[PDB]
Amino acid sequence: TRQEELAAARAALHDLMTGKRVATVQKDGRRVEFTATSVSDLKKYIAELEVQTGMTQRRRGPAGFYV
Amino acid sequence: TRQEELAAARAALHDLMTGKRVATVQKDGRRVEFTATSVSDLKKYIAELEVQTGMTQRRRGPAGFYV
Amino acid sequence: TRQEELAAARAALHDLMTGKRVATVQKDGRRVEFTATSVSDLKKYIAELEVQTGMTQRRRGPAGFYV
Amino acid sequence: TRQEELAAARAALHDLMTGKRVATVQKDGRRVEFTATSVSDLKKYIAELEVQTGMTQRRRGPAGFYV
Amino acid sequence: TRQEELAAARAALHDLMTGKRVATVQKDGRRVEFTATSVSDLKKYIAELEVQTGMTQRRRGPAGFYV
Amino acid sequence: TRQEELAAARAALHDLMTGKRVATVQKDGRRVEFTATSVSDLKKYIAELEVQTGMTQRRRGPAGFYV
Amino acid sequence: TRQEELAAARAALHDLMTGKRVATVQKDGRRVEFTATSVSDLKKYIAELEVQTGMTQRRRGPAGFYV
Amino acid sequence: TRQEELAAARAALHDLMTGKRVATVQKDGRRVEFTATSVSDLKKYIAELEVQTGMTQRRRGPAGFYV
Amino acid sequence: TRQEELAAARAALHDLMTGKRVATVQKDGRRVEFTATSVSDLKKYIAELEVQTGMTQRRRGPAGFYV
Amino acid sequence: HGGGSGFGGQLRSWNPPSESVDAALLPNFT
């Protein structure tokens, strides 16, 4: 249960980024809201889980120099 | 109870990251709110309990240097 | 009775930082809200209470060196 | 009569730190608010009162050194 | 009046420390509040008043150093 | 009138320190509030009033040294 | 009008210090408020208007030194 | 037409210092709020207007030194 | 049209400095409010518009020295 | 003059008990 976690996190990130992350909803006697999370830490979390799971290669090992 | 503590903390962190940590709920005269903890503090908590528990190696000890 | 209150406190910390620290509770004409506290203070309180109570070993005298 | 005040103060510390200090109670048409002190000054008061009262030893005199 | 005034001030300090410094009080239609002071100012007021009054001292000379 | 002004200042400071300065009063149709002065400002004002009035010595001059 | 202006200003200053710098006056249907001023600025305004006024000695010229 | 401006500004400063610079006015349906100024800029305006107007000698320049 | 708005701005500055720049006005569901400015920007605007228009000299060009 | 009190009091409370050399040595000789 990791790939669907990654997909849900990416979808939520996109929704928050554009316009879609609903903060609060009000109906007649129904006030329900969810605390928002910063995009920076959301990106850190999604990157961490992506590199933790069996996903492909994204990071590289430093960089050597040669004349 | 450490295992279900692990599971609950992981699920709570995931839902808070995505969309699903409700601050308050209101029902036409029945509204209750909950204190929101920092994402960094939640990360520290989950890491501390995970390393305390019997889960396998997550971090090793320093790193040697050889020529 | 240190153990009882220590266990209650740690369970309260877990519940509060996961999802369930009731800040305020409302009825029709009944409002009751409790004071809120940070997490670092209660964490260090738990640490000091555990160390002052006769629990298992948790801290060790510095760390020496040798060639 | 310092002992009873110390007991009251430590109980207040416990309940405030966990969940059980009400900042204010609002019965319908009958409401009252109490000033919320911090945990820092509260434990300062705890320390000063417990050291001025003739309870057990809590702290000693510096620390010697020997080869 | 100094002695009973000091006793009342100490009692008020204890009440504020624990739970009893009433910030505001309201009944149907009638509402008042009392401006709340800090803790350090109150305790230093207590200290200076206890010093200036004629009861037993708590302050001595600076120090003495002898080999 | 300096002496009674000083007495009023002393009583006001005592009320402020303990519990007894009203920030506002309300009578469901009539309500009035007052600005809250700083405790340090009140102390400075009462001290300068004590010095200026015909009160006896409170503060001496600078202390000289002798061997 | 310097004398009565000074007297009114000083009385207002004393009232503000003690208990009765009314910030707002509210009767049902009619609510007004006056602006709130600092204390140090009022004190220095009092001092400068005094030294402008032909009142008694209030200041001196630097200070002299002699062995 | 500057002397009457000076008189009006001085009166405004006096009443603002004492008690009488109204911020809001409410009559059960009609409300007027006036912008809040400060004291520093007000006395700067007083000084600039008094020096520009036909006000008499109030300010002198540098200083001489002699033995 | 320069002197007209010069005088208008000067009068507005005098009003704001004295007491009655209307921040907002309301009467039975007819509420409007006007944005506020700062005295510094208003004065510099006055100065620059005065320079732009044909008002007499107010500022000059440095000042030479001579023994 | 200099032995009176000192500058601004200064050594106003230092007054050695003028005494014999034996009276200075013998009491704490050992």
Secondary structure of residue A33 in the 3-state scheme: strand
Return the beta strands (E) in H1-67 as ranges: 22-27, 30-34
CA atoms within 13 A on the CB side of H10: 14
- B30 forms beta bridges with B27
Closest CA to F9 of F29, F30, F39: F39
One-letter amino acid at E11 equals A
Tokens 């928002």 identify what position?
A36
Is residue C33 within a helix (H) or strand (E), and if so which, with residue range?
strand C30-34
How distant is the Cα of E50 from the closest Cα of chain F, in angstroms? 14
Closest alpha carbon to C21 in C11, C31, C30, C29: C11
Task: Indicate the residue of C17, C19, C26 with minimum beta-carbon distance to B30.
Answer: C26
Beta-ladder partners of C50: none
Q: Which amino acid makes up residue J7? A: F
Among candidates B39, B53, B37, D12, which has minimal Cα distance to C15?
B37
- Angstrom resolution of this structure: 4.1
Residue from F32, F39, F44, F50 whose CB has the most chain G CBs within 10 Å, to mutate: F32
Nearest C-alpha of chain F: how many angstroms from E9?
6
Please answer whether residues E40 and E18 qualify as being in contact, where contact means their C-beta atoms are separated by less than 8 angstroms: no
Q: Is D32 on the interface with E (CB under 8 A)?
A: yes
Q: Give the N- to C-terminal CA distance of chain E in Å, as an integer.
A: 47
Q: DSSP secondary-structure letter at E20?
A: -
Experimental method: cryo-EM
For H4, the enclosing helix (H) or strand (E) is: helix H3-18
Nearest to C19 by CA among B24, A49, B18: B24
- Cβ(G23)–Cβ(G33) below 8 Å: yes
Phi, psi of E24 (to 5 degrees): -145, 160
Q: Are B23 and B34 in contact (CB under 8 A)?
A: yes
Which chain C residues contact residue D31 at CB under 8 A?
31
Kindly give, in sequence order, each residue whose CB lies less than 8 Å from that of residue B12, ignoring residues fewer than 6 positions away.
B21, B42, C18, C19
Q: How far apart (Å, rounded) are the C-alpha atoms in residues F25 and F34?
A: 9
Q: How far is CA D50 from the centre of its chain?
A: 10
Q: Residue H26: list chain I partners with CB under 8 A.
A: none
Phi/psi at E17 (nearest 5 deg)? -60, -45
Residues with Cβ within 8 Å of E45's Cβ and at least 6 positions away in sequence, in order, are E9, F17
Q: Would you state the structure tokens that stand for residue F12, as one six-digit string?
A: 């006001």
DSSP F22-42: EEEEEESSEEEEEPPPPHHHH
Q: Do chains E and I touch (3 or more CB pairs under 8 A)?
A: no
Token pair recorded at residue E63: 């120090």
Question: In which residue are the tokens 């948790």 written?
Answer: C58
Give, in order, the Cα–Cα distances in Å from C59 to each of C41, C51, C65, F53, I37: 19, 8, 18, 62, 61
Report the b/e string of F26-60 with b at 16+ CB within 10 A: beeeebbbbbbbebeebbebbeebbeeeeeeeeee
**Distance set, CA I67 to CA H61, H64, H66, I64 (Å):** 18, 16, 18, 10
Token readout for F18 is 């303990």
Is the Cα dihedral A47, A48, A54, A60 positive or negative? positive
Q: If 0-12 CB within 10 Å is exposed, 13-18 middle and 19+ buried, where does residue B49 land?
A: middle
**Please, which residues bridge with residue E26 across strands?**
D31, E31
Total Cβ atoms within 10 A of residue H15: 18
| Phi (first) and psi of residue A14, to 5 degrees | -65, -45
Does residue A25 sit in helix, strand or coil?
A: strand
Which uninterrupted H or E stretch holds D23? strand D22-27
Q: Cα dihedral angle (F22, F23, F29, F30), rounded to 10 degrees?
A: 70
Amino acid making up residue G31: R
Structure tokens at G67: 């062995």
Other residues' Cβ atoms within 10 Å of the Cβ of residue A38: 10
Q: SS3 letters for chain B?
A: CHHHHHHHHHHHHHHHHHCCCEEEEEECCEEEEECCCCHHHHHHHHHHHHHHCCCCCCCCCCCCCCC
Q: Report the sign of the C-alpha dihedral through residues J15, J19, J21, J27, in that order.
A: negative
Asked if A12 has any chain B CB less than 8 Å from its own CB, the reply is yes
What is the residue whose two structure tokens read 């309180």? C45
Structure tokens at B27: 């029902």
Q: Do D35 and E36 touch (CB under 8 A)?
A: yes
Which residue(s) pair with B24 in the sheet? B33
Which ranges of chain D would DSSP assign to H, the alpha helix?
A: 2-18, 39-52
| Residue where the block lists tokens 């009655």 | I20
Separation of alpha carbons B25 and A24, rounded Å: 10
All domains of chain H, ordered by start, with CATH? 1-57 (3.30.1580.10)
3-state secondary structure of E11: helix
